[PDB]
Design a protein around this ligand. Structure first.
Ligand SMILES: Nc1ncnc2c1ncn2[C@@H]1O[C@H](COP(=O)(O)OP(=O)(O)OP(=O)(O)O)[C@@H](O)[C@H]1O
Lengths: 79, 28
């Protein structure tokens, strides 16, 4: 996969990440969707500039910070 | 915990679909 994508989680482990505020709720929603058995894919939809990339980095933070249930906690996030 | 019918569902749906109308308030 590294041939085709950037390991966002590893970058986050190495810092290189800008923290978020407020968007924690859509992050929690993201985690809740990822935790689903069938429709496992959350998508961030909205205006440009809202912070959707910021959310995905926020997701990386939750992975890095162990704020995510094990089934997602160990996830390796890629761009 | 367990899934509780309309409780979990109304909240869940509102969170994704919008419509907080169905959540019911912590205090009206
Ligand atoms: N909580 C936050 N909300 C908004 N922006 C944030 C937040 N935290 C960090 N940022 C910074 O602000 C910018 C948010 O940009 P982001 O890419 O998320 O916009 P977007 O929703 O992806 O639309 P786009 O596709 O024009 O980037 C980023 O450059 C990010 O570094």
């Amino acid at each position: 996969l590294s041939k085709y994508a950037i390991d966002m989680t590893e970058q986050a482990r190495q810092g290189k990440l800008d923290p978020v505020i407020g968007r924690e709720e859509e992050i929690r929603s993201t985690i809740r969707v990822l935790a689903r058995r069938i429709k496992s894919n959350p998508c961030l939809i909205g205006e440009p500039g809202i912070g959707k990339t910021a959310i995905i980095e926020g997701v990386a933070q939750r992975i890095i910070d162990d704020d995510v249930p094990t089934i997602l906690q160990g996830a390796k996030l890629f761009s | 915990q367990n899934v509780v019918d309309s409780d979990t569902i109304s909240e869940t749906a509102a969170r994704l679909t919008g419509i907080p109308v169905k959540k019911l308030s912590e205090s009206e």
